[PDB]
């Protein structure tokens, strides 16, 4: 159970942030989710302080992070960091990352 | 028929070289078409001035060492890449640097010529040590469009040049960084409309607003030939 | 299916959803409600034979609230033999099982909109209306005999605006083809009150 | 399958190069495309919500 | 939206009576007996009270002194 | 000191298929203009299409006529594909009346001045009975994009006649757009490119008008950019 700030969207499906799926053990194959509204003011304050997603990044079981990137993210990053022996722009010297982006894009 | 034209063009210019620009609301799908067109035009085709070649009085190859500069030659080339100069009338001009004594040789120490203005007088170039501190060089700056790497000129160097002719990468375009995000924005019933936030960092010379101005201007002059419904 | 196994025709024929010819002949009349076939003289019974008529079934409610409609395949004057498939049942074409539809896919991650097993789809599919299904709900109004008196089905319904009656006939039943919405009065009934 | 693809004048490896329709730059490393027979199952969102 | 309350819990380390003082303040704010000491940016009164707590203007003792005054 | 693109020869291979060329394009603007045009064309081209139909003997989309083999719903599906060119008015009422055995094609529509039936052989229905007769009145509107029935249902505006049959409107004539930038040897220049945009349409919009309107829209948005208030 976690609290989120809603953003109005079209459609009849709830949109769930990807990083938290691991925490929910949620899968997009017809799994459904329930949504409750805290009524009194103390409940609202409790939700925003104690239960909000950003406040729960470490698992209560062990200390390690729960929101680690799962599958697509890690694949993209892996592709990004691996190097190749020979390519375009071998061995030129750049003054910083900004022109690196200039060159790649 | 009747389209939806953008209003409320807000621009938050923190740190004059860094400008965030917000644009809403935009018809469906035009976010990416327009963002990408602008980005490519800004990045690839922009008239500017930049350092092209350099002659060192002391070293014949880029890996040799000059006595009394702790920084290697490559560091000097990298410092010269950052030089943002604006010349007014002449097309190609040759600046001379001659410095002695202890301390940081900065852009200000260049000989003050007529048409050329160095926007950043405090940009470090070299560090000179004690009692010898002899630095002399001739840097040629030219006008051009876009980005020109060293490799493409050095390829076509069958025209043999005297030793010391050190080629430098030409950074003509004044934009150092450009990016655009597109995000959802709804007019009270239609949700599939989008806002374009363009974050741009330039290299001092021109302020971002006017950069955008001439970018949009350029694309419009090319398009001008067909557009006639007015 | 572009890629099948060949069993589709066996399944379609053997299920009772198709209309299959019992005595081969020639199709005399084709309509979108019935197919009338003139039997061939060879197989034609001598005494009191006549011709064969196949009445088709149009949109009715299945157990799952789906539509059960049969379409004719053949045209006027085509010869038919015993055991061929005249009319296609639900989700079958020309005798073959066609459960769904075959579309052009590309295997790639597209800005994490297909992050997990989720699927991205192009607007052309909805524009061309190829995944639109018809469903069918059944509703029942029962007028019993109470001991205070039988209830009535009349169209005279207390303190309802004439807007609600507009779509009702004089007998109190909606007109076939009328467009209704949630909360609209399907049929008018009054419970009698006594004492 | 390879033979049938060749007879149609398509890449024998069954993958083609695709251009991103939104931005226009080419994708590195060509991708697998082709027609697959899909079904819409009875789990329809309007009943679940 | 105020995505983290870490500084408010650093003000009162119990992390529970934080919720109580913030609820009392936000309840004095909603039923309009009091006024916010911070310029609101279209926040609701809960996040306003947390924003006030993190800036050090309000705690339990300030509530008690102001109430008796 | 620049170049500028001039619209050159526009080859027409078929009534639907067309090639449009732009010769003097500066380096780098090839892809920019190609993609911008592709987007505008595919997204924003205005066209006309049938919005709703009334046939006489039919209460609702799901019933059936005597002497026809298609269901009424399939008849609407056939009408959705009807390619028509309207010149002056915004809403036209076409009339189709046919009797006897035969395929009712699009050619049988009552010939009005302002309406052009692009593909007269396009089939609509098949009659199967000597005395079977079909009469119908098709209402055609102008619009952009894709509008379904169900959204317009909010604005019903006295849909009271049960004979009305609403059809989803695909207000868009262009089916496909591709472009190629290839080396444009200009007699006095080294590296120039020419853009060839080949477009496939249903044969209503002429290429020149499409390209002109697309360039117009893009130029308009750029105009919006030229001024910057900063106020
Ligand atoms: Mg699941």
Q: Give the CATH number of the domain where residue E29 resides.
A: 3.90.940.10
F contact test, residue of B2, B44, B215, B219 with most F CBs within 10 A: B219
Two structure tokens written together for F13:
């291979």
Indicate the resolution in Å: 3.4
Q: Are the beta carbons of F140 and F52 closer than 8 angstroms?
A: no
| Whether B221 and F46 lie within 8 Å, measured CB to CB | no
Nearest to F178 by CA among D21, B89, B8: D21
Whole-Å CA distances, E2 to A35, E17, E56: 21, 19, 16
Chain C residues with CB under 8 Å of A75 CB are: 109
Q: How far apart are CA B113 and CA B95, in angstroms?
A: 8
Long-range contacts of E49-53 (CB under 8 A, 24+ apart): E49/A45, E49/E22, E49/E23, E49/E25, E50/A45, E50/A48, E50/A49, E50/E2, E50/E5, E50/E8, E50/E22, E51/E2, E52/E25, E53/E8, E53/E11, E53/E18, E53/E21, E53/E22, E53/E25
- B135 exposure class (CB count in 10 Å sphere: 0-12, 13-18, 19+): buried
User: Of B56, B126, B117, which Cα lies nearest the Cα of B86?
Assistant: B117
Q: What is the spatial distance between Cα B183 and Cα B193, in angstroms, rounded to a whole number?
A: 8
Instruction: Quickly tell me which residue has 């080629």 as its tokens.
Output: B167
Asked whether the beta carbons of residue A12 and residue D43 sit closer than 8 angstroms, the reply is: no
What are the structure tokens assigned to B16, written together? 């004059």
Burial state string for F58-74 with b = 16 or more CB within 10 A and e = fewer than 16: bebbbbbbebbbbbbbe
What does the alpha-carbon distance between residue A26 and residue A33 come to, in Å, rounded to a whole number? Answer: 9
Tell me how close the Cα of A20 comes to any Cα of chain D, in angstroms: 22
Instruction: Identify the CA nearest to B165 among candidates B49, B93, B51, B61.
Output: B61
Count CB-CB contacts under 10 A for residue F9. 8
Distance CA A12, CA A29 (A): 16
Q: Which residue of A has its CA nearest to D41?
A: A30
**What does the alpha-carbon distance between residue D37 and residue B103 come to, in Å, rounded to a whole number?**
74
Question: Quick one: F215 exposed, middle or buried, by C-beta within 10 A (0-12, 13-18, 19+)?
Answer: buried
Q: Which of D27, D33, D37 sits opposite C1 (nearest CB)?
A: D37
Query: What angle separates helix E17-30 from helix E45-54, to the nearest 10 degrees?
Result: 130
Q: How far apart are CA C10 and CA C8, in angstroms?
A: 6
Query: Domain F46-171 falls in which CATH fold?
Result: RNA Polymerase Alpha Subunit; Chain A, domain 2 (2.170.120)
Q: Per residue, what are the HEC states of C119-148? A: CCCCHHHHHCCCCCCCECCCCCCCCCEECC
**In chain D, count of helices (H) and strands (E)?**
2, 2
Burial class (CB in 10 A: 0-12, 13-18, 19+), F18: buried
**In this structure, what token pair is assigned to residue C137?**
């709900």
In whole angstroms, give the CA distance from residue A4 to residue F78.
Answer: 48
The H helix count followed by the E strand count for chain A is: 4, 0
**F2 and B221: CB-CB below 8 Å?**
yes
Structure token pair of residue F99? 């009797």
**In a 3-state reduction of DSSP, which class is residue C108?**
coil
Task: Report phi then psi at E24, rounded to 5.
Answer: -60, -45
Long-range contacts of F2-5 (CB under 8 A, 24+ apart): F2/B221, F2/F26, F3/F192, F4/B221, F4/B222, F4/B224, F4/B225, F5/B222, F5/B225, F5/F29, F5/F33, F5/F195
Q: Which two tokens stand for residue A99?
A: 């022109």
Q: Check CB contact under 8 Å for D35 and C99.
A: no
Right CATH number for B47-171 from 2.170.120.12, 1.25.40.10, 3.40.190.10, 1.20.1050.10?
2.170.120.12
Cα–Cα distance between B210 and F226 in angstroms, integer? 10
The answer to whether B189 faces chain A, any CB pair under 8 Å, is no
Return d(Cα F175, Cα F162) in angstroms, integer.
34
Mutation for D interface: A9, A10, A11, A12, most D CBs within 10 A: A12
* Distance, CA of F92 to CA of F111 (rounded, Å): 12
Chain E touched by A44 (CB under 8 Å): yes
C-alpha atoms less than 13 angstroms from C-alpha of B103 in its C-beta half-sphere: 8
Strand ranges (E), chain C: 19-20, 25-30, 34-39, 52-55, 60-61, 67-68, 71-72, 79-80, 85-88, 92-93, 96-97, 101-106, 145-146, 149-150
d(CA B182, CA A17): 18
Measured CA to CA, the distance from residue B111 to residue E18 in angstroms comes to 65
Q: For residue F164, which of F125, F137, F191, F198 has the smallest C-alpha distance?
A: F137
Q: CB of E58 within 8 A of CB of E25?
A: yes
Distance CA A42, CA F155 (A): 43
Burial class (CB in 10 A: 0-12, 13-18, 19+), B213: middle
Interface residue B225 vs chain F (CB under 8 A):
yes
Q: Which technique?
A: cryo-EM
CA distance F44 to F221: 14
State yes or no: chains D and E have 3 or more CB pairs below 8 A.
Answer: no
Length of chain A: 105
Closest CA to F118 of F105, F137, F99: F105
How would you list the strands of the sheet with D31-38, edge to edge?
Answer: C101-106, D31-38, D15-16
**A31-50: string of b/e by CB count within 10 Å (b at 16+)?**
eeeeeeeeeebbebbbbbbb
Neighbours of chain C (3+ CB pairs under 8 A): A, D, F
Which tokens in the block code for residue D23? 């931005």
Touching B: F residues 94-153, CB under 8 Å: 144
State the burial class of residue C194 (Cβ atoms within 10 Å of its Cβ: 0-12, 13-18, 19+). exposed
Bridge partners, D19 (sequence order): D26
Q: What SS3 state is found at C36? A: strand
**Integer Cα distance of C67 and C132 in angstroms:** 12
Give the strand order in the sheet containing F174-183: F7-12, F17-25, F193-201, F174-183
Q: Map residue F92 onto helix, strand or coil.
A: strand
Q: Which of D43, D46, D49 sits opposite A30 (nearest CB)?
A: D43
Cβ distance B117 to B108 under 8 Å? Answer: no
Whether the CB-CB separation of A105 and A89 falls below 8 Å is answered with no
Give the distance (Å) from ligand 1 centre to CA of residue C99.
24
CA distances from B84 to B18, B115, B172, C94 (A): 16, 14, 9, 74
Can you give the three-state secondary structure of chain B, one letter per residue?
Answer: CCCCCCEEEEEECCCCCEEEEEEEEECCCHHHHHHHHHHHHHHHCCEEEEEEEEEECCCCCCCCCCCCCCCCHHHHHHHHHCCCEEECCCCEEEEEEEECCCEEEEHHHCCCCCCEEECCCCCEEEEECCCCCCEEEEEEEEEEECEECHHHHHHCCCCCCCCCCEECCEECCCEEEEEEEEEEEEECCEEEEEEEEEEEEECCCCCHHHHHHHHHHHHHHHHCCCCCCC
CA distances from F28 to B41, B47, E4, E41 (A): 8, 14, 47, 45
Identify all chain A residues contacting B18, using CB atoms and an 8 Å cutoff.
none
CB half-sphere exposure, B98, CA atoms < 13 A: 3
For residue D23, the chain A residue with the least C-alpha distance is: A105
Mutate to test the interface with D, among C96, C102, C137 (most CBs of D within 10 A): C102
CB contact set of B230 (below 8 Å; sequence gap of 6+): none
Tell me how far CA of residue B149 lies from CA of A87, A103, E40, in angstroms: 15, 10, 52
Whether B217 contacts F226, CB under 8 Å: yes
Tell me the two tokens of residue F91.
């809403």
Pairing of the two strands B47-56 and B135-145: antiparallel
Rounded Cα gap, residues B141 and B147, in angstroms: 14
The span from the CA of A94 to the CA of A85, in Å, is 18
Cα of D37 to ligand 1 centre, how many Å? 22
By CB atoms closer than 10 A (0-12, 13-18, 19+), residue C35 is buried
Q: Are F47 and F81 in contact (CB under 8 A)?
A: no
Is B196 within 8 Å of B26 (Cβ atoms)?
yes
Contact (CB, 8 A) for B185 and B195: yes
Distance CA C130, CA C121 (A): 13
Cα–Cα distance between B124 and B106 in angstroms, integer? 4
Q: Distance of CA C33 to CAs C51, C56, F67, Å? A: 17, 5, 9
Of C102, C105, C131, which has the smallest distance from its Cβ to D33's Cβ?
Answer: C105
Q: Are C34 and C20 in contact (CB under 8 A)?
A: no
Contact F28 B40 (CB under 8 A): yes
Q: In sequence order, what are the residues at sequence separation of 6 or more whose Cβ sits closer than 8 angstroms to the Cβ of residue B190?
A: none
Distance CA C105, CA F112 (A): 44
3-class secondary structure, C51: coil
Please name every residue paired with C101 in a beta bridge, in sequence order, or none if there are none: D38
For residue B126, the tally of other CB atoms under 10 A from its CB is 22
**CB contact at 8 A, F35 and F27:** no
Q: Work out the angle at residue A92's Cα, subtended by the Cα atoms of residues A91 and A98, and round it to the nearest 5 degrees.
A: 125
Which residue in A1, D19, A20, A77 sits closest to C116, CA to CA?
A20
* Backbone phi and psi for residue C46, each to the nearest 5 degrees, phi listed first: -60, -55
As a whole number of angstroms, the distance between CA C182 and CA C133 comes to 20
3-state class of A77 per DSSP? Answer: helix
Matching residue, tokens 């909606």: C174
Spatial distance between the Cα atoms of F222 and B6, rounded to a whole number of angstroms? 11
Burial class (CB in 10 A: 0-12, 13-18, 19+), D27: exposed
Phi, psi of A72 (to 5 degrees): -65, -45
Q: Which residues share a beta bridge with F96?
A: F109, F136
Residues whose CB falls within 8 Å of the CB of residue E50, separated by 6 or more in sequence, listed in order: A45, A48, A49, E2, E5, E8, E22
Question: By the 8 A CB rule, do F125 and F150 touch?
Answer: no
Q: Which of C49, C54, C30, C29 is nearest to C39 (CA)?
A: C49
What whole-number distance in Å separates Cα of residue B27 and Cα of residue F39?
A: 12
F7, F31, F46: residue with CB nearest B226: F7
Exposed e or buried b per residue across C91-128, where buried means at least 16 C-beta atoms within 10 angstroms of its C-beta: ebeebbbbeeeeeeeeeeeeeeebbeeeeeeeeeeeee
Structure tokens given for E22: 């913030």
Cβ contact C116:A20 at 8 Å: no
Q: Which of C31, C59, C177 sits opposite F128 (nearest CB)?
A: C31
* B29 backbone φψ class: left, alpha, beta (φ>0; ψ -120 to 50): left
Mark yes or no for CB contact C118/A71 under 8 Å.
Answer: no
| Length of chain B in terms of residues written | 230
User: Peptide bond before B101: cis, by omega within 30 degrees of 0?
Assistant: no
The range of the structural domain enclosing residue E23 comes to: 5-68
Question: Which among F223, F224, F230 has CB closest to B11?
Answer: F230
Return d(Cα C141, Cα B223) in angstroms, integer: 68
| Nearest-CB residue to F162 (from C69, C71, C177) | C177
Chain C residues within 8 angstroms (CB to CB) of chain A? 109, 112, 115-118
Nearest-angstrom CA–CA distance, C32 and C55: 10
Q: Residue F177: beta bridge partners?
A: F199
What is the number of domains present in chain E? 1
* Strand, coil or helix: F42: helix
Q: Is F88 exposed, middle or buried (0-12, 13-18, 19+ CB in 10 A)?
A: exposed
Instruction: Residue E22: name the closest of E11, B86, F168 by CA.
Output: E11
Q: Is B145 on the interface with D (CB under 8 A)?
A: no
D49 min Cα distance to partner chain A (Å):
7
Residues of A in contact with C117 (CB under 8 A): 27-29
Residue for token pair 């009271």: F160
Task: Output b/e per residue, F31-46; b: 16+ Cβ within 10 A.
Answer: bbbbbbbbbbbbbbbe
Enumerate residues 154 to 173 of chain B having a beta carbon within 8 A of any beta carbon in chain D: none
Instruction: Using CA coordinates, name the residue in chain D closest to F177.
Output: D21
Q: Do residues C82 and C43 lie in contact, with contact meaning Cβ atoms separated by under 8 Å?
A: yes
Alpha helix ranges (H) inside A29-94: 41-46, 72-81
Q: Could you tell me if F91 and F52 are in contact, meaning their C-beta atoms sit under 8 angstroms apart?
A: no
Of E28, E24, E26, the residue nearest E2 (C-alpha): E26
Looking only at the bridges linking them, the beta strands covering B135-145 and B7-12 are: unpaired
Give, rounded to a whole angstrom, the gap between the first and last alpha carbons of chain D. Answer: 43
Decide: helix, strand or coil at residue C105.
strand
């Amino acid at each position: 159970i976690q609290a989120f700030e809603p953003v109005l969207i079209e459609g009849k499906a709830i949109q769930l942030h990807p990083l938290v799926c691991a925490a929910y053990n949620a899968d997009f194959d017809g799994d459904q989710m329930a949504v409750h509204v805290p009524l009194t003011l103390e409940a609202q304050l409790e939700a925003r302080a104690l239960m909000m997603s950003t406040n729960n990044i470490l698992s209560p079981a062990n200390g390690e992070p729960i929101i680690v990137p799962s599958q697509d993210v890690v694949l993209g990053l892996y592709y990004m960091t691996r190097d190749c022996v020979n390519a375009k722009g071998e061995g030129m010297v750049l003054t910083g990352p900004k022109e690196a982006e200039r060159l790649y894009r | 028929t009747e389209f939806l034209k953008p209003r409320l063009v807000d621009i938050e210019q923190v740190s004059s070289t860094h400008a965030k620009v917000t644009l809403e609301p935009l018809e469906r799908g035009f976010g990416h078409t327009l963002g990408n067109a602008l980005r490519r035009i800004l990045l690839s085709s922009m008239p500017g001035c930049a350092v092209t070649e350099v002659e060192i009085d002391g070293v014949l190859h880029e890996y040799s060492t000059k006595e009394g500069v702790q920084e290697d030659i490559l560091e000097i080339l990298l410092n010269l890449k950052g030089l943002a100069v604006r010349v007014q009338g002449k097309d190609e001009v040759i600046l001379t640097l001659n410095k002695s004594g202890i301390g940081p040789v900065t852009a200000a120490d260049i000989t003050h010529d007529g048409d050329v203005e160095i926007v950043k007088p405090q940009h470090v170039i070299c560090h000179l040590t004690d009692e010898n501190a002899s630095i002399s060089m001739r840097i040629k700056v030219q006008r051009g469009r876009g980005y020109v790497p060293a490799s493409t000129r050095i390829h076509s160097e069958e025209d043999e040049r005297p030793i010391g002719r050190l080629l430098v990468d030409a950074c003509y375009s004044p934009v150092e960084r450009i990016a655009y995000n597109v995000e959802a924005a709804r007019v009270e019933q239609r949700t599939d409309l989008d806002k374009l936030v363009i974050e741009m960092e330039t290299n001092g010379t021109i302020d971002p607003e006017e950069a955008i101005r001439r970018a949009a201007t350029i694309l419009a002059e090319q398009l001008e030939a067909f557009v006639d419904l007015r | 299916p572009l890629v099948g196994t060949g069993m589709e025709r066996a399944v379609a024929v053997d299920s009772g959803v198709t209309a299959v010819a019992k005595r081969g002949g020639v199709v005399q009349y084709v309509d979108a409600s019935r197919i009338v076939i003139k039997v061939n003289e060879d197989e034609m019974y001598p005494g009191e034979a006549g011709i064969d008529i196949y009445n088709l079934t149009k949109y009715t409610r299945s157990n799952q609230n789906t539509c059960i409609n049969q379409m004719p395949c053949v045209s006027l004057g085509e010869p038919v033999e015993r055991g061929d498939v005249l009319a296609d049942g639900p989700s079958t074409d020309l005798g073959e099982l066609a459960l769904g539809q075959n579309m052009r896919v590309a295997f790639m991650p597209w800005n994490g909109y297909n992050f997990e097993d989720s699927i991205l789809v192009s607007e052309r599919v909805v524009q061309e209306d190829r995944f639109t299904t018809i469903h069918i709900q059944e509703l029942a109004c029962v007028s019993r005999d109470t001991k205070l008196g039988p209830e009535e089905i009349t169209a005279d319904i207390p303190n309802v605006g004439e807007a609600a009656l507009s779509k009702l006939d004089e007998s109190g039943i909606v007109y076939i083809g009328a467009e209704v919405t949630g909360g609209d009065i399907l049929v008018g009934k009054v419970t009698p009150k006594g004492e | 399958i390879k033979e049938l693809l060749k007879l149609g004048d398509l890449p024998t490896s069954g993958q083609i190069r695709l251009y991103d329709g939104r931005t226009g730059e080419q994708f590195e490393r060509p991708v697998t495309v082709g027609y697959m027979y899909m079904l819409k199952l009875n789990h329809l969102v309007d009943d679940k919500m | 939206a105020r995505v983290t309350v870490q500084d408010a819990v650093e003000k009162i380390g119990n992390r529970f009576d934080l919720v109580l003082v913030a609820a009392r303040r936000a309840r004095q704010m909603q039923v309009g007996g009091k006024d916010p000491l911070v310029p609101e940016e279209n926040d609701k009164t809960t996040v306003i009270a947390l924003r006030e707590i993190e800036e050090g203007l309000i705690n339990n003792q300030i509530l008690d002194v102001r109430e008796r005054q």
